[PDB]
Design a protein around this ligand. Structure first.
Ligand SMILES: *[C@@H]1O[C@H](CO)[C@@H](O[C@@H]2O[C@H](CO)[C@@H](O)[C@H](O)[C@H]2NC(C)=O)[C@H](O)[C@H]1NC(C)=O
Ligand SMILES: *[C@@H]1O[C@H](CO)[C@@H](O[C@@H]2O[C@H](CO)[C@@H](O)[C@H](O)[C@H]2NC(C)=O)[C@H](O)[C@H]1NC(C)=O
Ligand SMILES: *[C@@H]1O[C@H](CO)[C@@H](O)[C@H](O)[C@H]1NC(C)=O
Ligand SMILES: *[C@@H]1O[C@H](CO)[C@@H](O)[C@H](O)[C@H]1NC(C)=O
Ligand SMILES: O=C(O)CCC(=O)C(=O)O
Ligand SMILES: O=C(O)CCC(=O)C(=O)O
Ligand SMILES: [Fe+2]
Ligand SMILES: [Fe+2]
Ligand SMILES: [Fe+2]
Ligand SMILES: [Fe+2]
Ligand SMILES: [Mn+2]
Ligand SMILES: [Mn+2]
Lengths: 686, 686
């Protein structure tokens, strides 16, 4: 049994990058002893000088491995046991490819189903045997170390004398390149390993050599104590006097729904505004009225503000370069926060949480509501298109939560200002090529060995759909009930609707079988009324309605139907989602799909039609929503139910009436004496 | 100016018949002096002997006229003025036909547009001139008086010497035969005359000679004081201790609706039953159960009773002969009352009123409800078929009321027993020929000069329709809603329905929008239930209904639809007539034609289906009629309206519930624990 205190791990690194520190944490997890060369071709020269101290130490086992692209998955005890089991005095890692000299592939011994060729990224042997190898180095730093070990190994006499071997079946070393299909994660309670399903082994050293850095990043999120079924993630903050100064950059590169809401939300972020500088690039002339309306509040709120409008003809890549460089060139910019207009931050502590994670680059996970689409990618295709990773759905669904090393992030991220100055000083981060600005940004950080972190440890927010947003309306957000229903409800559905639907005594019954509940917010009423007048073609003479009064005759109103303004599909959707469930609640036993042929807005004026004579409705039940204020906008009565001698004297603006349309509720519209009275009517289930 | 006290009217009559007395009343109306010969050919012999007393009375004007077929229409003053105007000493009446000797027509003077030939039924002249004519009679009673006067008149020398003339243009005498189209009634305030529109004259003497007795009967109902626009009829009773003994004869010669009702009505006639003998001839085996059920009550009610059933194979003519002869052969039968089963006597004083009119034969006017058809004819065709008289519609509509001399009566009449014994002693009154028994009866009385009187002075009753009465039912009267709606309502519609419909606080509201009103009588419920069980094919497994419960699913019942028993058309009629107007009253503003696809009788039993789970109705409103008694026939609850926490604990048998079918009135049928519970359901306006 070889003594673990006699095992020494040697690696080389010239800077404490995130990869090197990831390697050290995995080594410290298993209580390895690590000697790092070169911090304070050239690899062998450093190792050879290092080995002269251990030239006679037959009692020492030394494992040399890379650090930037290596994680440890097993204990020194298991490692020394497998080394003794190999019966070798210097065991090299094996791999699928023979390089740099492909011609030397013939000199290699036949291996069978295992890997045949040497890889100098990881080997383990006795100090004495290794010293006899590395002392034979008398070349220069530019020269190839892989060729040095390969030629020495291919020496048949030197191979048998020193007992050199290759770990053919990946018992100890696992090189990822050429063997991605062989490696799977093997989970335990508080530790994760890899398994080679080709040779049924549990390698100790995971080496992401060649073009497999992204696959190592993925494995490194678990191995050895990245994320565990019982302990969760092991490097995140988990459970959570001046805060750092932050440059907040907002980007509007396309017409975006609910932008006035996004701008107003900027005033609610729980981070001191005197410590935040706002940069806002708006590329859309359609959003110029929006930016202008809320700019006075933003200017008073934040420390400093700056707007770059559509007039400067800035492409998204140029605007993102400019905003990022403004932070880079300011020694007082400690953190850079890039937030796109289609990102809805439901968690107002997002900027704090991400800063406290203390990463170079970190994004809050944001997903399109009810779908898998989100602001990060788990994997890439060879030509850098989206590909779904093995754990992508688990992360989006938050089955596994933590801080994850991912190939792609977007729409919201926080970048350490020191990183922009020291490690990424160039201006062309998003620009400089024909590739997409968002992908050029991720590649720029990947090319410098900078991890892109993603946190789903909390609920941060969601992503608006902007794909096909019809801007040809007076209020386009009114037509967003399908694409962004969650945000459409927060803007247009009355705030106390859900409380009323859940009971809580909000629903009223002003007349016997007539119910009264809050439905539309004051903004929906104002925009719907405005949209009606913008059309302007109200009905008049020869207008016919589905009303029954004193026999087979019809009662008309000055009105506009939803079909005319192209809003029936949208209003029908509201009827299904909100009116329907309310009607089944208030009328136990009744079921409805909220069918409605007659949906229309009535206008009452003393100038034209001020009243509506007694009549019945061609409907099972009728929805009657007030659209403006009694007293402020109009005077005069509302609704009278003659058989019950009951009158809705004061209609509440956002609220709606629900009454039977036939037989029992002969109803009348009282004359409107001053101003203009607007209501929204639906004859449901005809 | 000739003195009216010098004018004497002479007529001949051997009995004081109704025609003779009619003539006398018209004569007494104008204060004529009438000498009747022959009371205590042969006509001339009596007149000739009479005239010998006045052979030298040049101061006397004598008018000889018939009496049985003559009515006077003018005053002696006007008569003497027109006689003086004629410039004649013996003026005969003129007519269109030359008889008995047609060959003598050539000897007559040419007359132009007037009548050319003599009629010996009426002449006026000086007593002296008449004596010189009548004294020339030396023949026998069998010989012809018309030929006697005609040959004397055609003597050219005697015609000029005595100044004989004919009333060519009907200035004084109007013979009806051959001039019916020339005669119209001329009305005044309190007197009616005739006018000859051919010659524009107002004749004094109306003579219904030849085959014109019926037309004289018609004229005689007005002239001179028969019926007047301001005085009304002048020989009727107008404004109304043992009563005379009466033989009441009832005839059932065809299947007749509501016969149990007719039989029970016999017990309510306001005439002492100890003075009435009942004869009942029933020809229908279908009515044998009816006669038997009510015979014990009839036997106890009347003085004596006698039934002649279908087993004696008696034709209607034979039965009517037998019943009439039973009265004729009994000196104690003072009046004979013949009442057919299709005659509904709404006036229980009918027998009194007709007896107090003091006529030989008199009928109460009875008409089919809402139609002109009635129990008398105003006119006849030459072959004795129905013809409409000039005043028929006025009499049926009771625009003119009185007691009218008519050619035909039926279905109800009162005959003086003395008339049957003295004036109509034969047995074959209705029988003895191939003519109809009802027409043979009228002809028999007409042939004896007996008037057939008809009284519309009061509202007496109506005539049931028996034309197509489908006897192939357990209760055929249930299907009489179309043919006899008035009588169908009295039997099957609840007695307090009309009072409830007119207000009076009978209608109740046991639950919020659920109304409760009396609809069906206890007899309708018992017969409808009995008719359902007689069919017996109640529904069971796979039975589907138009009920909505907890989604798109259907709730079944053990029931039978009206369509199955062939009663939908009849029940739909009841819905229109009675349910409809009630629904529009209780739901002001709602209009309905009472459409209903689902009409059915539900049966509840603990053995089978005792309850009905909560559900809605496929209807605007639902009619729910109880059909039996809670407690007596069944135990267990009725109807529960869940949204209102209201229960119809005790359903009233005849009553019905009216509630909305959709949205608001989720209702449930409580389990029936004992017995059998029947209800009638209609889903109106689906
Ligand atoms: C939703 O309900 C809340 C509470 O029931 C409403 O809040 C109140 O607003 C009125 C003024 O309109 C104040 O006088 C009360 O003091 C408030 N109550 C509370 C508890 O804050 C709120 O107005 C309702 N929403 C809308 C749109 O009216
Ligand atoms: C129709 O209404 C009358 C009066 O409202 C009902 O008559 C009463 O009958 C009950 C017995 O059922 C008696 O106790 C009362 O004294 C009666 N009142 C009068 C004023 O006579 C009659 O019952 C109703 N019709 C039906 C079929 O029930
Ligand atoms: C590593 O060593 C420390 C003491 O130096 C010990 O507490 C810990 O349990 C060790 N961990 C492992 C995995 O052996
Ligand atoms: C008939 O005579 C009586 C008196 O005898 C007289 O009262 C009556 O008015 C007369 N009627 C007519 C119509 O002359
Ligand atoms: O003005 C009202 O409140 C009555 C509305 C109504 O019944 C209708 O819109 O047809
Ligand atoms: O039994 C009752 O009264 C409920 C009747 C009902 O709702 C039905 O007949 O469908
Ligand atoms: Fe309309
Ligand atoms: Fe309406
Ligand atoms: Fe049924
Ligand atoms: Fe029902
Ligand atoms: Mn490497
Ligand atoms: Mn005569």
């Amino acid at each position: 049994p070889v003594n673990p205190e006699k095992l020494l791990v040697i690696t080389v690194a010239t800077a404490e990058t995130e990869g090197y520190l990831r390697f050290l944490r995995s080594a410290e997890f298993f209580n390895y002893t690590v000697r790092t060369l070169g911090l304070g071709g050239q690899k062998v020269r450093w190792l050879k000088k290092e080995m002269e101290k251990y030239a006679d130490r037959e009692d020492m086992i030394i494992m040399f491995v890379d650090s930037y692209d290596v994680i440890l998955a097993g204990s020194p005890t298991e490692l020394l046991k497998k080394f003794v089991q190999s019966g070798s005095r210097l065991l090299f890692s094996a791999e699928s490819f023979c390089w740099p000299e492909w011609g030397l592939a013939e000199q290699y011994p036949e291996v069978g189903t295992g890997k045949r060729f040497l890889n100098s990224g990881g080997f383990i042997g006795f100090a004495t045997t290794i010293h006899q190898i590395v002392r034979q180095w008398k070349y220069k730093d530019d020269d190839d170390d892989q060729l040095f070990y390969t030629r020495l190994y291919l020496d048949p006499g030197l191979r048998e004398k020193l007992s050199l071997n290759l770990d053919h079946k990946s018992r100890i070393f696992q090189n990822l390149n050429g063997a991605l299909d062989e490696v799977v994660l093997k989970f335990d309670r508080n530790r994760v390993r890899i398994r080679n399903v080709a040779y049924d082994t549990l390698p100790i050293v995971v080496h992401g050599n060649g073009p497999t850095k992204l696959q190592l990043n993925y494995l490194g999120n678990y191995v050895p104590n990245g994320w565990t079924p019982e302990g969760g993630c092991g490097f995140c903050n988990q459970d959570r006097q001046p805060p750092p100064r932050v440059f907040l950059a907002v980007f509007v590169e396309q017409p975006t729904p609910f932008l006035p809401r996004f701008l107003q939300r900027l005033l609610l972020l729980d981070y001191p505004p005197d410590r935040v500088t706002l940069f806002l690039h708006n590329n859309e002339v359609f959003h110029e009225p929006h930016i202008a309306d809320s700019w006075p509040q933003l200017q008073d709120h934040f420390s400093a503000v700056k707007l770059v409008g559509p007039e400067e003809a800035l492409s998204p890549g140029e605007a993102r370069d400019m905003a990022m460089d403004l932070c880079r060139q300011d020694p007082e910019c400690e953190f850079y926060f890039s937030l796109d207009a289609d990102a809805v931050l439901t968690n107002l502590q997002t900027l704090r949480i991400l800063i406290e994670e203390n990463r170079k680059v970190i994004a809050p996970m944001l997903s399109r509501h009810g779908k898998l689409w989100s602001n990060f990618w788990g994997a890439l295709s060879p030509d850098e298109y989206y590909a779904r990773s093995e754990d992508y759905v688990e992360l989006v669904q938050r089955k596994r939560v933590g801080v994850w090393n991912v190939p792609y992030i977007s729409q919201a991220y926080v970048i350490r200002g020191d990183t922009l100055r020291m490690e990424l000083p160039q201006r062309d981060v998003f620009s400089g090529s024909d590739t997409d600005p968002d992908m050029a940004f991720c590649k720029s950080f990947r090319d410098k060995g900078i991890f892109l972190h993603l946190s789903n440890q909390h609920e941060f927010g969601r992503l608006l759909a902007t794909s096909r947003y019809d801007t040809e309306h007076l209020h386009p957000d009114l037509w967003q009930i399908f694409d962004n229903p969650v945000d459409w409800k927060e803007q247009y559905i009355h705030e106390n609707y859900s409380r009323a639907l859940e009971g809580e005594g909000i629903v009223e019954q002003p007349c016997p079988d007539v119910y009264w509940f809050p439905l539309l917010s004051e903004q929906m009423c104002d925009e719907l009324v405005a949209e009606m007048e913008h059309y302007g073609q109200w009905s008049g003479g020869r207008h016919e309605d589905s009303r029954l009064a004193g026999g087979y005759e019809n009662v008309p109103t000055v009105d506009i139907h939803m079909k005319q303004v192209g809003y029936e599909d949208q209003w029908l959707q509201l009827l299904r989602t909100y009116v329907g469930p309310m009607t089944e609640s208030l009328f136990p036993g009744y079921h409805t799909k909220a069918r409605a042929v007659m949906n229309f807005v009535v206008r009452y004026r003393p100038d034209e039609q001020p009243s509506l004579r007694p009549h019945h409705d061609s409907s099972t039940f009728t929805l009657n929503v007030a659209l403006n204020h009694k007293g402020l906008d109009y005077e005069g009565g509302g609704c009278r139910f003659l058989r019950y001698d009951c009158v809705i004297s004061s209609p509440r603006k956002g609220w709606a009436l629900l009454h039977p349309g036939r037989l029992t509720h002969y109803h009348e519209g009282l004359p409107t004496t001053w101003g203009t009275r607007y209501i929204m009517v639906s004859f449901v289930d005809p």
